[PDB]
Amino acid sequence: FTKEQVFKIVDKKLGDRYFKDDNKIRPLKFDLILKSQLKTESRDEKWYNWNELLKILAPIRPDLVPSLVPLMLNDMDSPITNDVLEAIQNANALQQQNAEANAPYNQQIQALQIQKLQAEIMELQAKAHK
Amino acid sequence: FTKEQVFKIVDKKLGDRYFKDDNKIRPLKFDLILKSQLKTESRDEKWYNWNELLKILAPIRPDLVPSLVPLMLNDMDSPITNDVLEAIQNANALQQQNAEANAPYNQQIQALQIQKLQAEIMELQAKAHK
Amino acid sequence: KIESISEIRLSPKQEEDRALSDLLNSLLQVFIQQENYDKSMIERDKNLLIGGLGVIQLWVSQDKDKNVEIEIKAIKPESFVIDYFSTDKNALDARRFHKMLEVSEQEALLLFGDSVIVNYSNVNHERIASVIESWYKEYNEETQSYEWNRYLWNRNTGIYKSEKKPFKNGACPFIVSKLYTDELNNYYGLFRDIKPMQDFI
Amino acid sequence: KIESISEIRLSPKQEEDRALSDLLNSLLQVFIQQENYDKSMIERDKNLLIGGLGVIQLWVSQDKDKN
Structure with missing residues (x-):
């Protein structure tokens, strides 16, 4: 398998994580362990692993959970996926737009409270x- | 097994914990105990031990638990692991970035409250x- | 066995091998979800259950657009001769594998050019040919490792085509496993122990 | 016996031996997850059950690349 043959099959991140070479996959002897499992497609296996990981990480560390759901939804084999991803992008754009629209009022309130607490001094x- | 043969098989931490030598593994006589178990791969056994340890340590000491989940997720045999680890790194980078961005306001409030309590004196x- | 078809996933030994393994598990999916995989596995299990042999060959065919692919084909075990010196299951200490193939005329023209003489048949009208493909394990003298070489030949005609190390590693394309090897070096299968019950029925 | 294939893990006697043992349990995995292990164990159990003997040999072969 050449490098352009590999990059036509795998994603960009999976290709960039391995090639930091000499344009060839060079596995060593003590590198891989062969584990048998049921023959399933990769997106379904990743979806099940994402589901069990989000059901595990919910009580122990909740703040990690809402940063994982776009990475979970990118690995979904559903036909509604291309709609959910642009819905996430539009919601994030609207949220950061409202945040950057309301931020001058917040920094004004911060500076004004600082000036009040200095006026008390x-x-x-x-x-x-x- | 030579030292470079050992360091091609095991992780860096497992190699560095044993070699503080004379470039050879020298076990003594009263050092090891042989315990039989089922033949399983090392990452799955470590995953099960991490799961039972986090389910044990949850009521007795909770503050130890969220510092263990990157060390738990590093020992996962799932294909989503390389995404979860960079998600953790991005979340920690964003958290420390927000903390170091908001820290001058916090130390300003601290010094200002100190000056107010001295002005009362x-x-x-x-x-x-x- | 049809619904419990087993695939093999790869796991990293060290922590730095994960970016390798999650790469290779993505590259084995074009070997998994091809059309020939389930057919070859079910033919393999049927040959392992009815008889004792299971033979699966692999190929590295590259068609036209720099697209390297790993074909998989289950071989009919009656048209497959193993070295008689190998005693164990999986046939790992075997020095030669022979397969006796029927080949049509134009497939024989595509397999090797018209410069060498082909001994055809005349079975009805089509000039088929019986070609024995042998894979021999021989150690080289430049490097001190074993390599597998291919000889397409016919009985009482000679050698049609001889190639040495035709896989860039000297790897035999065949994967063999024998269920229930016994004394006198035969494969026993599930047929012989349930045969007298069927005869009595 | 096929699905209950037993491996041997190593445990430290003292507290300082753990960095040894967790090393060696990582080094026995290339002896565990090789292809010949399950074949040799199932052949061993078949020979121990049909007859009385079970014989397993080990070798320390080193091929070409200091491996």
């Missing part, structure tokens, strides 16, 4: 001086 | 003096 120091 | 001392 100079007020109490002037009262102590007088 | 000088205010009450000036009132007592007058």
Whole structure:
């Protein structure tokens, strides 16, 4: 298998993780372990592994869970996948748009509270001086 | 087994924990105990041990649990593992980026509260003096 | 066995081998989900259950557009001769494998050119030919390793085509396994122990 | 016996032997997951059950690349 033959079969990330070479797959002797399993397609196996991993990681570490669901939904063999992915992209675009639209008000409130807490310093120091 | 033969088979940490020598594995007589078990692959056995350990350590000491899940997920034989690990790295990078971005405001609030509580000292001392 | 068809996934030994293994498990899927895989596996299991032999060959054919593919074909075990010196199952200490093939005329023209003489038959009108393909394990003298060489030949005609190390590694394309090897070096199968019950029935 | 194939894991006697044992359990996996292991064990059990003998030999072959 040549390098362009490999990159026509596998994804870009799977190709880029192995080739950091000399344009050839060079496995060593003590590198691979052969494990038998049932013959299933790769996206279905990845979907089942994603499902059990999200059902395992839910009580022990919840904040890791909502960052995994686009990576879970990218590995779905459903025909609705191309709609769900652009729905996720539109929701993330709307969320970051609202965040960057409301951020000047937040930094204004932050600076104004800082100025209020400094005004309390100079007020109490002037009262102590007088 | 030579040292380079050993380091081609085992991980870097497993090699570094044993060789602090004379470039040879030298086990003593009263060092090892032979225990029979079912023939299973090492990552599956480590995955089951990680699962039972996280289900044991959950009520007795919870703060140890979220520091173990990257070490648990590194020992997973699933094909989604290379995605979950970079998702963990991106989440940790974003978390430490937000923390180091918000930390000047936190230390500003700390110093300002310290100055307010000192201004109360000088205010009450000036009132007592007058 | 049809619904419990077993595939082989690869797991990393070290932590750095994972980017290799998750690559290769993605590259074995074009070997898994091809059309010939299930046919060859079910033919293999039928040959292992009825008789004792299971023979599956692999090929590295590359058609026109730089597309290397791993074909898989289950071989009929009666048209397959193993070296008599190999005693164990899986036929690992075997020095030669012979397969006796029927070959049509134009497939024999495509298999080797018209410069060498072919001993055809005249069975009805079509000029078929009986060709024995032998795979021999011989160690080289330049390197000190064993390589497999292919000889397409006919009895009482000579050698049609002789190629040495035709796979870039010297690997035999055949994978053989014998169920129930016994004394006198035969394969016993599931047929012989249930045959007298069928005869009495 | 085919599905209950037994492997042997190593446990430390003292606390300092663990870095040895977890090393050696990682080095026995290339002896465990080789192709000849299950064949030799099932041939061993068949010879121990049909007859009385079970004979298994080991070798330390090193082919070409310091392996």
